[PDB]
Amino acid sequence: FDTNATRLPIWGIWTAEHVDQTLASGNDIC
Amino acid sequence: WAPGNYPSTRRSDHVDTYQSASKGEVPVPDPYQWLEESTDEVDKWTTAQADLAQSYLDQNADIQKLAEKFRASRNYAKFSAPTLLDDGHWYWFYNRGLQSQSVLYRSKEPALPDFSKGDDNVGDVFFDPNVLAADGSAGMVLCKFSPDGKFFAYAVSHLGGDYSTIYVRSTSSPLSQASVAQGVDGRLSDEVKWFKFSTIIWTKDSKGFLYQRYPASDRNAMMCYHKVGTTQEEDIIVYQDNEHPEWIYGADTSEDGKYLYLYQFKDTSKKNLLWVAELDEDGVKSGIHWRKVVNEYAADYNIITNHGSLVYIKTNLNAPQYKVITIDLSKDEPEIRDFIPEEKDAKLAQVNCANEEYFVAIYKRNVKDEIYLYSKAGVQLTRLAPDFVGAASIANRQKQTHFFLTLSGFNTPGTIARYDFTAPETQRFSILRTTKVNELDPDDFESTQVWYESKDGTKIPMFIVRHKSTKFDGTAAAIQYGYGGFATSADPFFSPIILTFLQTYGAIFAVPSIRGGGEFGEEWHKGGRRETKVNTFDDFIAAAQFLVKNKYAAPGKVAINGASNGGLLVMGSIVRAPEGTFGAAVPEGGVADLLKFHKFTGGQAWISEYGNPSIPEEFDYIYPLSPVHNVRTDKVMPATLITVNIGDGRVVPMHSFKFIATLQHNVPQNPHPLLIKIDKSWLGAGMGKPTDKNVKDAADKWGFIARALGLELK
């Protein structure tokens, strides 16, 4: 996680085709 | 559709006067200043524009055929790396294929699942974001289990609002359609509102968590602590600075429970303060004593871990490519030493501590990630996944005897690798799961890296992806992606929709590593930032010219796409490039008014990237670059489809409205269509749209490009 990167002019937490972030979504949940 | 039939758009006589260091006082007409507002006139205008856009897309029969292709390409099972909680069970996200939000699963047994059996066969639903609202409007933006594994904090975004709300539930209380139907929701009473630009940072006692909130534009951020089993009125303010209202905050807690770290950021640059507080066992209270270790904005500092008073920190202090330092806090004047020195030609992207004393490091060399395992003595022990080509991340908890790597790229959909320290030395590294796609074969696609030269002589790498039947013989169409800013690397990524488009039309996909990004560290960002921002555009334009010149793509068959800063990139690129450089342009939610970006929502932080329009010296390099203020009457523009979400709070849709209105005014008889597609669903802060809606939007975008470049379905 990057605090300052959550407020960039960027598509979603760098393109519209990044739609699915399921692969990395379990990397830091604890 | 024909040329010269755009909606009637009123031109006001609003004039803003700016100070220029060279020109003195400069009056800048802003006839579409009124498109900043939310009014009935603007509602009529957005309706008219959207109907015109949809009318043109209705003429293209191939869009419906692409939607079929793209839906099928997306329709495959997807999954995260699993996380072992302290209850002994493993938790991972799972998507059946086309679910708008993935579902958090929990292992049936307290053991690592054999995932070849199937996710439902080895686990049950723990947390389903899709049922947070009955209509599916509520989105889980992030979540965090407590260290002890007993609670699950989760931030929920609603449609309409610009803030998330954190709720807490016991991990023994699952959220599913079954649990909702059978009883009460099952969460605790806790309701922590006004959460934004933050994560959830549990204290190691599992009693509560740290979070950033705002008061009930966004200013006066507060770092706060919430205790589990209480209300938000009882939450402690951990830090605020009313003297610097524009500053924001982050936090971290050491695994041993000894330290509380505070980060402070003044803008979107990679520069932060770092204060350290010592926790005594009852945990976070009011009146925390801060030791001001880093107390000036100079470099990037992110904590990796600590052993006693020795703190390990990933930093770019006197090290543009990043490195690991140790700061010994037992010393009154702390001694700073290199633990893992800077590599001159590889950016240190991430470092996690694993199995208590080892370090897993990800280096980015020529925009390609390399994974290494380091010992406690800083010795590089081995390279992991040496033949992997793409982007990589680490998933672990420090105290545990394993870690995972999530691996992906242009033709790697999603590999999850496991390293197990308890196994025999030759058998530690293994593949846990490989993502299986639908219809596509990733082996049909080749990715290569080629170098081209910008206007100033700088050599820039660029990824080129194609279906392997496609020849570099000056006949293929090209789709050129870019972001170009904020030290954000344009990394490799798997897109089944892109690969499907490439196979369908025999086109190629291009990703130049332009300056402004962080592909080669701080100096690469500095090369396309503020006064040097023009280099980003020159790099991006040169890339497109190189593709045509060297026979990768046909003349006039290079389309360009980008989102947000990528929207600014594409909008500025069509204005600045020679006629016929591009065959199509698709800016998605882009910045465009660079004279007023800082006046709206969180735009003021982006002065780090673009400069300040109010400063005369900086106005002089912004004004000639601003897409809104540099459209001409004598240049034929390529077919343009601008896309925005009207509820976008990050980049106000203002930017795109002014640009399309200015385009339509200046070149009303342009032979190619200049359209804007406007989504009117107020999408909440940190959400995807629904899956079916994404597929439809993709089909529109890629179909528009296909038709603009004269591509047919074989």
XYZ file of C-alpha atoms in Angstrom:
744
model
C 0.000 0.000 0.000
C 1.028 3.595 -0.778
C -0.940 6.358 1.018
C 0.146 9.149 -1.329
C -0.615 6.996 -4.430
C -4.324 6.622 -3.469
C -4.946 10.282 -4.486
C -3.130 10.300 -7.867
C -4.989 11.039 -11.079
C -5.075 7.293 -11.888
C -7.867 4.898 -12.978
C -8.215 2.509 -9.999
C -6.573 0.996 -6.897
C -2.909 2.558 -14.468
C -5.489 1.764 -17.241
C -9.172 0.964 -17.826
C -8.199 -2.682 -18.620
C -6.862 -3.199 -15.057
C -10.611 -3.822 -14.191
C -9.823 -7.086 -12.331
C -7.504 -6.738 -9.323
C -8.458 -10.136 -7.804
C -4.927 -11.594 -8.224
C -3.264 -9.074 -5.870
C -6.299 -8.401 -3.575
C -5.169 -10.920 -0.910
C -1.565 -9.664 -0.657
C -2.065 -7.436 2.429
C -5.308 -8.295 4.277
C -3.600 -9.039 7.636
C -23.339 11.637 -38.200
C -21.610 14.188 -40.403
C -19.128 17.019 -39.733
C -20.472 20.282 -38.253
C -23.474 18.881 -36.337
C -22.328 19.176 -32.711
C -24.634 20.311 -29.862
C -25.265 24.029 -29.351
C -22.748 25.040 -26.667
C -22.956 28.553 -25.162
C -19.715 30.568 -25.132
C -19.628 32.889 -22.101
C -17.396 35.980 -21.817
C -15.718 34.805 -18.589
C -12.055 35.878 -18.570
C -9.447 34.854 -15.988
C -6.304 36.995 -15.764
C -2.993 35.251 -14.958
C 0.490 36.579 -14.186
C 3.286 35.519 -16.550
C 6.974 36.054 -15.726
C 7.817 36.774 -19.403
C 4.533 38.297 -20.683
C 3.423 40.201 -17.538
C -0.379 40.085 -17.250
C -2.231 37.656 -19.576
C -6.041 37.546 -20.023
C -7.175 33.955 -20.655
C -10.732 33.605 -22.075
C -12.666 30.709 -20.496
C -15.935 30.590 -22.529
C -16.783 27.110 -21.177
C -16.144 28.054 -17.511
C -19.857 27.327 -17.000
C -19.167 23.589 -17.691
C -17.444 23.537 -14.249
C -20.943 23.741 -12.710
C -23.829 21.322 -12.043
C -26.922 22.921 -13.636
C -29.907 22.290 -15.925
C -27.995 23.806 -18.880
C -25.108 21.390 -18.240
C -27.626 18.505 -17.933
C -29.059 19.383 -21.379
C -25.549 19.644 -22.838
C -24.272 16.340 -21.354
C -27.485 14.617 -22.502
C -27.093 16.007 -26.048
C -23.405 15.010 -26.260
C -24.047 11.505 -24.846
C -26.965 10.904 -27.243
C -24.779 12.020 -30.175
C -21.971 9.694 -29.041
C -24.345 6.734 -28.609
C -25.998 7.514 -31.974
C -22.613 7.232 -33.716
C -21.745 4.001 -31.874
C -25.170 2.587 -32.922
C -23.995 2.785 -36.588
C -21.158 0.316 -35.809
C -22.496 -3.273 -35.961
C -19.112 -4.692 -34.823
C -19.464 -3.279 -31.267
C -22.105 -5.899 -30.375
C -19.812 -8.634 -31.780
C -16.848 -7.364 -29.712
C -19.011 -7.362 -26.540
C -19.649 -11.098 -27.116
C -15.898 -11.691 -27.597
C -14.865 -9.566 -24.586
C -17.445 -11.145 -22.231
C -16.227 -14.649 -23.166
C -12.586 -13.532 -22.742
C -13.367 -12.271 -19.194
C -15.451 -15.355 -18.251
C -12.876 -17.369 -16.277
C -12.226 -18.157 -12.596
C -9.927 -15.682 -10.819
C -8.338 -15.803 -7.377
C -5.925 -14.095 -4.983
C -2.996 -15.536 -3.061
C -4.203 -17.026 0.243
C -3.413 -15.570 3.708
C -2.939 -17.709 6.845
C -4.639 -16.091 9.861
C -3.839 -16.947 13.508
C -6.966 -19.169 13.717
C -5.033 -21.654 11.511
C -7.293 -21.177 8.461
C -6.482 -19.756 5.011
C -8.429 -16.878 3.415
C -8.451 -15.837 -0.270
C -10.559 -13.891 -2.777
C -12.436 -15.822 -5.482
C -14.395 -14.637 -8.532
C -16.576 -17.146 -10.433
C -15.828 -15.165 -13.608
C -18.056 -12.144 -14.166
C -18.891 -11.123 -10.570
C -18.674 -7.354 -10.000
C -16.840 -8.015 -6.721
C -14.735 -11.031 -5.741
C -15.803 -12.972 -2.646
C -13.535 -13.630 0.354
C -13.371 -17.391 1.029
C -12.237 -19.280 4.149
C -10.661 -22.765 4.099
C -12.842 -25.605 5.433
C -9.814 -27.167 7.175
C -6.985 -25.438 9.109
C -4.519 -26.431 6.373
C -3.258 -25.124 3.023
C -5.880 -26.155 0.430
C -5.128 -28.298 -2.614
C -6.611 -25.653 -4.930
C -6.878 -28.087 -7.889
C -9.979 -29.500 -6.105
C -11.840 -26.160 -6.634
C -12.508 -23.134 -4.398
C -16.016 -24.228 -3.317
C -14.719 -27.787 -2.732
C -11.941 -26.525 -0.365
C -13.576 -23.446 1.227
C -16.742 -21.642 2.302
C -17.806 -18.017 1.852
C -16.627 -15.734 4.675
C -17.186 -12.248 3.210
C -19.262 -11.421 0.108
C -18.996 -7.679 -0.795
C -21.835 -8.061 -3.349
C -24.516 -8.370 -0.606
C -23.406 -5.223 1.354
C -26.361 -3.597 -0.409
C -29.329 -5.507 -1.892
C -28.947 -3.607 -5.203
C -25.136 -4.184 -5.332
C -24.438 -0.443 -4.947
C -22.124 -0.836 -1.909
C -18.460 -1.617 -2.662
C -15.727 -2.942 -0.370
C -12.731 -0.708 -1.234
C -10.299 -2.383 1.191
C -10.172 -4.648 4.242
C -7.885 -5.827 7.030
C -8.036 -8.790 9.431
C -6.674 -8.150 12.928
C -3.275 -9.745 13.823
C -4.950 -12.295 16.154
C -7.448 -13.153 13.366
C -10.542 -12.452 15.493
C -11.886 -9.343 13.707
C -12.292 -8.190 10.104
C -12.352 -4.441 9.439
C -13.701 -3.424 6.005
C -14.179 -0.050 4.293
C -17.453 0.342 2.357
C -18.109 2.956 -0.354
C -21.696 3.932 -1.294
C -22.998 5.407 -4.573
C -23.220 9.222 -4.215
C -20.692 9.734 -1.390
C -17.002 10.746 -1.590
C -16.023 8.879 1.622
C -15.744 5.259 2.780
C -17.097 3.936 6.088
C -15.233 1.259 8.080
C -17.256 -1.495 9.767
C -15.995 -4.341 11.961
C -17.257 -7.921 12.266
C -16.095 -11.073 14.035
C -14.429 -13.526 11.620
C -16.806 -16.205 12.987
C -19.710 -14.087 11.634
C -19.673 -14.464 7.816
C -21.399 -12.084 5.366
C -23.312 -13.976 2.643
C -26.806 -14.178 1.125
C -27.431 -17.187 3.415
C -26.351 -15.379 6.614
C -28.283 -12.198 5.688
C -31.461 -14.202 4.946
C -31.182 -16.437 8.026
C -30.488 -13.669 10.583
C -29.162 -10.152 11.235
C -26.205 -8.751 9.196
C -23.895 -9.892 12.009
C -21.429 -6.991 12.239
C -20.520 -5.014 15.360
C -22.109 -1.638 16.143
C -18.903 0.260 15.143
C -19.411 2.781 12.307
C -16.248 4.733 11.435
C -17.201 7.370 8.811
C -15.231 9.928 6.723
C -12.422 7.473 5.846
C -10.344 8.490 2.780
C -6.857 8.198 1.197
C -5.807 5.591 3.742
C -5.647 1.956 4.808
C -6.547 0.155 8.054
C -3.536 -0.329 10.370
C -4.278 -2.602 13.333
C -2.223 -2.335 16.512
C -0.506 -5.668 17.287
C -2.697 -6.207 20.396
C -5.735 -6.488 17.994
C -7.696 -4.003 20.172
C -8.115 -1.323 17.506
C -6.869 0.223 14.287
C -5.381 3.425 12.928
C -7.088 5.209 10.007
C -7.122 8.627 8.302
C -10.338 10.642 8.310
C -11.563 14.095 7.318
C -13.974 16.494 9.070
C -17.731 15.857 8.891
C -12.699 20.299 -0.723
C -10.888 17.853 1.612
C -8.650 19.594 4.190
C -7.549 19.142 7.815
C -6.998 15.372 7.640
C -6.662 13.552 10.972
C -4.834 10.366 11.808
C -7.180 8.622 14.261
C -7.371 5.429 16.330
C -10.577 3.385 16.633
C -11.035 0.901 19.493
C -12.955 -2.301 18.601
C -16.363 -2.490 20.320
C -16.914 1.296 20.646
C -18.368 4.280 18.730
C -16.516 6.917 16.662
C -17.008 9.663 19.312
C -14.543 7.714 21.507
C -11.861 7.624 18.749
C -8.531 9.230 19.666
C -6.944 11.830 17.373
C -3.403 10.437 16.955
C -2.161 13.360 14.820
C -3.389 16.521 13.070
C -1.743 19.774 11.921
C -4.117 22.762 11.549
C -1.026 24.880 10.681
C -0.604 22.755 7.507
C -4.208 21.833 6.513
C -3.189 20.500 3.063
C -0.910 17.780 4.576
C -2.114 14.136 4.749
C -1.034 11.181 6.910
C -0.233 7.462 6.955
C 0.801 4.973 9.630
C 2.415 1.630 10.426
C 2.965 -0.533 13.526
C 5.946 -2.819 14.163
C 5.326 -6.583 14.353
C 6.847 -6.811 17.860
C 4.376 -4.178 19.193
C 7.120 -1.701 20.175
C 6.735 1.085 17.572
C 4.084 3.321 16.014
C 5.237 5.073 12.820
C 3.705 8.282 11.409
C 4.128 9.331 7.770
C 3.335 12.894 6.619
C 2.839 13.965 2.976
C 2.557 17.560 1.691
C 1.761 16.748 -1.970
C 1.760 13.820 -4.462
C 5.616 13.848 -4.709
C 7.573 10.901 -3.256
C 8.689 12.812 -0.149
C 7.500 12.173 3.404
C 8.329 12.855 7.034
C 8.809 9.892 9.384
C 8.256 10.133 13.135
C 8.535 7.179 15.520
C 6.597 6.633 18.768
C 7.304 3.946 21.390
C 4.211 2.024 22.495
C 3.780 0.639 26.020
C 1.632 -2.481 26.268
C -1.835 -0.877 26.792
C -1.446 0.545 23.237
C -2.383 3.801 21.519
C -3.531 6.635 23.795
C -3.723 10.434 23.509
C -0.465 12.372 24.063
C 1.911 10.119 22.076
C 5.565 11.216 22.236
C 6.882 11.574 18.665
C 10.598 11.256 17.897
C 11.125 13.307 14.721
C 13.588 11.042 12.860
C 12.877 12.489 9.394
C 11.553 16.051 9.840
C 12.068 17.586 6.377
C 10.656 16.778 2.939
C 13.662 15.400 1.047
C 13.277 11.673 0.270
C 10.889 8.697 0.241
C 10.835 6.634 3.481
C 8.823 3.417 4.000
C 9.346 1.065 6.983
C 10.092 -2.595 6.160
C 10.568 -3.962 9.701
C 12.676 -3.646 12.869
C 14.863 -5.841 15.073
C 15.079 -4.108 18.456
C 16.016 -0.433 17.993
C 17.389 -1.139 14.466
C 14.764 -0.034 11.913
C 14.905 -1.184 8.250
C 13.613 1.393 5.728
C 13.180 1.373 1.931
C 14.386 4.817 0.786
C 15.579 6.871 -2.196
C 17.663 9.223 0.023
C 20.720 10.015 -2.151
C 19.625 6.966 -4.167
C 17.283 7.640 -7.174
C 16.891 3.858 -7.786
C 16.000 3.209 -4.084
C 17.771 1.100 -1.436
C 17.428 -0.340 2.085
C 18.916 1.593 5.034
C 19.084 0.840 8.760
C 18.521 3.604 11.339
C 19.636 2.606 14.859
C 17.315 4.361 17.360
C 19.338 3.282 20.447
C 21.766 6.076 19.466
C 20.832 9.643 20.525
C 22.002 10.875 17.127
C 20.884 7.891 15.001
C 23.493 6.308 12.683
C 22.295 5.648 9.106
C 23.810 2.742 7.135
C 23.175 0.942 3.842
C 21.862 -2.616 4.380
C 21.163 -3.403 0.711
C 22.975 -0.777 -1.419
C 21.445 1.074 -4.386
C 21.653 -0.691 -7.746
C 22.583 1.875 -10.424
C 20.501 0.220 -13.193
C 17.584 -1.400 -11.289
C 14.866 0.227 -9.152
C 14.264 -1.365 -5.742
C 10.454 -1.628 -5.969
C 9.441 -3.578 -2.829
C 10.997 -5.304 0.208
C 9.118 -7.546 2.678
C 10.544 -9.218 5.777
C 9.789 -12.987 5.729
C 10.322 -15.821 8.264
C 11.344 -13.243 10.921
C 14.900 -12.542 9.626
C 14.941 -12.934 5.781
C 14.088 -10.257 3.198
C 12.249 -10.774 -0.128
C 13.187 -8.013 -2.624
C 11.616 -7.061 -5.988
C 13.909 -5.187 -8.422
C 12.574 -3.582 -11.619
C 15.254 -3.877 -14.344
C 14.292 -2.562 -17.816
C 10.678 -2.331 -16.556
C 10.700 -6.091 -15.728
C 10.513 -7.432 -12.168
C 13.149 -9.735 -10.661
C 12.596 -11.459 -7.301
C 15.434 -12.191 -4.838
C 15.684 -13.662 -1.329
C 18.161 -11.996 1.069
C 19.533 -13.301 4.387
C 19.631 -11.412 7.710
C 23.239 -10.415 6.866
C 22.114 -8.740 3.589
C 23.459 -11.584 1.419
C 21.537 -12.163 -1.837
C 20.887 -15.912 -1.426
C 18.972 -16.788 -4.617
C 16.875 -15.461 -7.492
C 13.287 -16.770 -7.393
C 11.276 -17.310 -10.608
C 14.272 -16.497 -12.872
C 12.455 -17.275 -16.167
C 9.367 -15.172 -15.251
C 8.796 -12.093 -17.453
C 6.349 -9.457 -16.149
C 5.305 -7.659 -12.948
C 5.550 -9.210 -9.452
C 4.363 -8.576 -5.874
C 4.917 -10.252 -2.485
C 2.254 -11.629 -0.129
C 3.331 -12.612 3.407
C 3.164 -12.106 7.160
C 6.602 -11.567 8.759
C 6.380 -14.151 11.560
C 5.276 -17.052 9.310
C 7.556 -19.636 7.665
C 6.319 -18.909 4.103
C 5.609 -16.213 1.554
C 3.905 -15.979 -1.831
C 4.625 -14.182 -5.077
C 1.785 -13.054 -7.355
C 3.109 -13.016 -10.932
C 1.531 -11.579 -14.092
C 2.288 -9.908 -17.424
C 1.133 -9.432 -21.020
C 0.717 -13.213 -21.458
C 0.817 -14.467 -17.842
C -2.789 -14.250 -16.526
C -1.959 -14.924 -12.848
C 0.552 -17.309 -11.275
C 0.747 -17.607 -7.469
C 4.122 -19.021 -6.354
C 4.840 -20.263 -2.812
C 8.149 -20.311 -0.953
C 8.230 -22.594 2.099
C 11.183 -22.260 4.509
C 10.285 -25.540 6.309
C 10.744 -27.680 3.147
C 14.086 -29.251 2.078
C 16.340 -26.628 0.436
C 15.821 -27.783 -3.197
C 11.992 -28.075 -2.804
C 11.046 -24.720 -1.182
C 9.846 -22.839 -4.287
C 6.642 -24.120 -5.956
C 3.592 -23.000 -7.967
C 0.413 -22.966 -5.837
C -2.000 -21.852 -8.581
C -1.970 -20.845 -12.249
C -4.881 -18.823 -13.652
C -6.707 -20.582 -16.515
C -8.268 -18.243 -19.101
C -11.211 -18.795 -21.507
C -10.961 -19.126 -25.346
C -7.561 -17.328 -25.476
C -4.266 -19.215 -25.365
C -1.585 -16.925 -23.811
C 1.097 -18.851 -25.783
C -0.358 -17.366 -29.021
C 0.945 -13.921 -27.936
C 4.530 -12.587 -27.962
C 5.794 -9.600 -25.955
C 9.140 -7.946 -26.821
C 10.952 -4.797 -25.679
C 12.356 -2.382 -28.293
C 14.233 0.909 -27.865
C 13.502 4.193 -29.683
C 14.910 7.731 -29.454
C 12.984 10.834 -28.344
C 13.427 14.341 -29.806
C 16.236 15.160 -27.307
C 18.196 11.920 -28.025
C 17.080 9.978 -24.909
C 16.664 6.217 -25.457
C 13.320 4.856 -24.234
C 12.144 1.239 -23.995
C 8.710 0.157 -25.247
C 6.791 -3.099 -24.870
C 5.256 -4.445 -28.107
C 2.611 -7.187 -27.772
C 1.105 -9.013 -30.768
C -0.663 -12.193 -31.790
C 2.167 -14.335 -33.213
C 0.607 -14.500 -36.714
C 0.844 -10.669 -36.980
C 3.856 -9.409 -38.962
C 5.851 -6.203 -38.430
C 5.503 -5.276 -42.132
C 3.850 -1.818 -41.926
C 0.261 -3.147 -42.211
C -0.927 -3.758 -38.610
C -2.829 -1.213 -36.531
C -1.334 -0.255 -33.167
C -2.847 0.623 -29.795
C -0.478 2.776 -27.754
C -1.069 2.971 -23.977
C 0.500 5.442 -21.574
C 0.243 7.122 -18.190
C 3.403 9.257 -17.957
C 3.579 10.753 -14.468
C 3.819 10.648 -10.672
C 6.596 7.997 -10.724
C 3.935 5.437 -11.762
C 5.531 2.699 -13.876
C 3.636 1.491 -16.965
C 4.194 -2.124 -15.887
C 3.178 -5.312 -17.736
C -0.345 -6.582 -16.984
C -2.708 -9.278 -18.296
C -5.766 -8.030 -20.177
C -7.925 -10.695 -21.879
C -9.837 -7.893 -23.670
C -6.639 -6.419 -25.200
C -5.320 -9.838 -26.308
C -8.769 -10.603 -27.785
C -8.669 -7.297 -29.714
C -5.149 -8.114 -30.987
C -6.129 -11.618 -32.172
C -9.401 -10.369 -33.722
C -7.898 -7.532 -35.804
C -4.209 -8.554 -36.027
C -3.290 -5.312 -34.244
C -0.406 -4.659 -31.841
C -0.292 -3.232 -28.336
C 2.426 -0.705 -27.418
C 3.526 0.620 -24.002
C 6.444 3.115 -24.153
C 8.191 3.683 -20.813
C 7.990 7.468 -21.196
C 9.566 9.948 -18.770
C 7.303 11.058 -15.927
C 6.886 7.417 -14.933
C 9.125 5.742 -12.339
C 10.452 2.901 -14.522
C 14.056 4.008 -13.934
C 13.612 5.708 -10.546
C 13.499 9.349 -9.440
C 15.591 10.719 -12.365
C 13.092 9.218 -14.865
C 10.221 10.953 -13.012
C 12.239 14.218 -12.812
C 12.738 13.964 -16.606
C 8.969 14.385 -17.199
C 7.817 16.579 -14.315
C 6.864 20.252 -13.828
C 9.144 22.302 -16.196
C 10.207 19.064 -17.962
C 6.592 17.759 -18.418
C 6.783 18.461 -22.183
C 9.300 15.558 -22.427
C 6.500 13.098 -21.506
C 4.525 14.221 -24.579
C 7.607 14.248 -26.830
C 8.450 10.694 -25.644
C 4.870 9.539 -26.303
C 4.668 11.223 -29.744
C 8.128 9.878 -30.727
C 6.935 6.374 -29.771
C 4.023 6.572 -32.246
C 6.267 7.948 -35.015
C 8.818 5.173 -34.378
C 6.071 2.511 -34.731
C 5.186 3.810 -38.216
C 8.789 4.596 -39.277
C 10.144 1.110 -38.395
C 7.160 -0.811 -39.904
C 5.577 -2.065 -36.637
C 2.325 -0.264 -37.543
C 0.795 1.152 -40.739
C 0.738 4.918 -41.518
C -2.155 6.569 -39.643
C -3.072 3.345 -37.767
C -1.735 4.203 -34.284
C -4.531 4.734 -31.739
C -3.719 6.186 -28.304
C -5.459 5.522 -24.966
C -4.957 6.579 -21.349
C -6.826 7.169 -18.082
C -6.696 10.276 -15.831
C -3.048 11.517 -16.216
C -3.123 9.187 -19.245
C -6.124 11.231 -20.427
C -4.038 14.417 -20.167
C -1.296 12.565 -22.076
C -3.563 11.619 -25.013
C -5.411 14.990 -25.094
C -2.155 16.977 -25.095
C -0.620 14.535 -27.601
C -3.324 15.018 -30.294
C -2.946 18.808 -29.907
C 0.887 18.811 -30.112
C 1.676 15.993 -32.599
C 1.751 16.562 -36.388
C -1.382 15.890 -38.490
C -1.940 12.164 -39.110
C 0.362 10.978 -36.289
C -2.635 9.232 -34.683
C -5.640 7.478 -36.268
C -7.721 7.508 -33.064
C -7.662 8.964 -29.537
C -9.506 7.842 -26.386
C -8.916 9.934 -23.209
C -10.683 8.401 -20.187
C -11.503 10.834 -17.343
C -8.496 12.992 -18.143
C -7.021 16.227 -16.808
C -7.043 18.970 -19.492
C -7.461 22.425 -17.927
C -3.921 22.686 -16.460
C -4.535 26.351 -15.489
C -7.385 25.441 -13.059
C -6.708 21.778 -12.002
C -5.568 22.943 -8.525
C -8.887 24.777 -7.834
C -11.002 21.552 -7.580
C -11.172 18.687 -4.996
C -7.677 17.097 -4.510
C -6.020 18.780 -7.512
C -3.759 21.044 -5.389
C -1.542 18.024 -4.531
C -0.746 17.581 -8.263
C 1.259 20.866 -8.274
C 4.107 18.392 -7.520
C 3.655 17.051 -11.090
C 2.357 19.972 -13.189
C 3.579 23.115 -11.375
C 1.500 25.937 -9.875
C -0.441 28.131 -12.395
C -0.487 31.036 -9.899
C 3.348 31.266 -9.923
C 4.384 33.444 -12.960
C 7.530 31.395 -13.691
C 5.555 28.147 -13.649
C 2.559 29.521 -15.604
C 5.027 30.089 -18.485
C 5.672 26.311 -18.840
C 2.099 25.145 -18.004
C 0.128 27.456 -20.363
C 1.740 26.176 -23.611
C 1.104 22.540 -22.504
C -2.533 22.832 -21.253
C -4.719 20.889 -23.777
C -7.768 23.159 -23.183
C -5.765 26.293 -24.128
C -3.771 24.980 -27.152
C -6.417 23.623 -29.584
C -5.981 25.081 -33.104
C -8.333 25.725 -36.040
C -5.967 24.462 -38.806
C -5.081 20.883 -37.685
C -7.227 17.849 -38.577
C -7.781 15.879 -35.356
C -8.066 12.077 -35.279
C -11.360 10.368 -34.431
C -11.751 11.108 -30.711
C -13.979 9.382 -28.132
C -13.662 11.049 -24.720
C -15.113 9.059 -21.780
C -16.028 10.359 -18.307
C -18.028 9.452 -15.236
C -20.106 12.459 -14.125
C -19.631 11.449 -10.453
C -15.805 11.390 -10.706
C -14.446 13.220 -7.639
C -10.752 12.507 -8.355
C -10.609 14.313 -11.721
C -13.695 16.526 -12.082
C -15.446 15.889 -15.460
C -15.040 19.646 -16.050
C -11.649 18.894 -17.643
C -13.069 16.658 -20.395
C -16.153 18.883 -20.953
C -14.020 21.979 -21.656
C -11.700 20.079 -24.030
C -14.467 18.499 -26.179
C -16.345 21.836 -26.312
C -13.114 23.562 -27.389
C -12.401 20.846 -30.006
C -15.960 21.082 -31.363
C -15.771 24.903 -31.521
C -12.322 25.073 -33.161
C -12.682 22.284 -35.767
C -16.488 21.871 -36.151
C -16.039 20.492 -39.706
C -13.349 17.927 -38.696
C -13.742 14.937 -41.074
C -13.460 12.527 -38.108
C -15.954 12.488 -35.189
C -15.126 14.331 -31.951
C -17.412 12.758 -29.336
C -17.808 12.429 -25.572
C -19.447 9.443 -23.864
C -20.802 10.382 -20.410
C -21.708 7.758 -17.784
C -24.325 9.184 -15.382
C -24.036 6.574 -12.589
C -22.444 8.357 -9.580
C -19.726 5.745 -8.927
C -18.441 5.857 -5.325
C -14.893 6.485 -4.123
C -12.871 3.304 -4.841
C -15.229 1.229 -7.008
C -15.431 -0.664 -10.221
C -18.636 -0.386 -12.254
C -20.640 -3.610 -12.758
C -18.991 -6.320 -14.905
C -21.631 -6.213 -17.671
C -21.283 -2.404 -17.823
C -17.447 -2.664 -18.103
C -17.789 -5.170 -20.976
C -20.231 -2.852 -22.799
C -17.913 0.153 -22.296
C -14.912 -1.861 -23.520
C -16.877 -2.941 -26.611
C -17.709 0.745 -27.322
C -14.117 1.998 -26.893
C -12.371 -0.750 -28.879
C -15.100 -0.798 -31.563
C -14.739 2.977 -32.018
C -10.970 2.551 -32.459
C -11.476 -0.408 -34.831
C -13.834 1.585 -37.086
C -11.694 4.763 -36.887
C -8.669 2.770 -38.159
C -10.747 0.948 -40.836
C -10.393 -2.532 -39.302
C -12.808 -5.319 -40.311
C -13.707 -8.658 -38.677
C -12.328 -11.585 -40.711
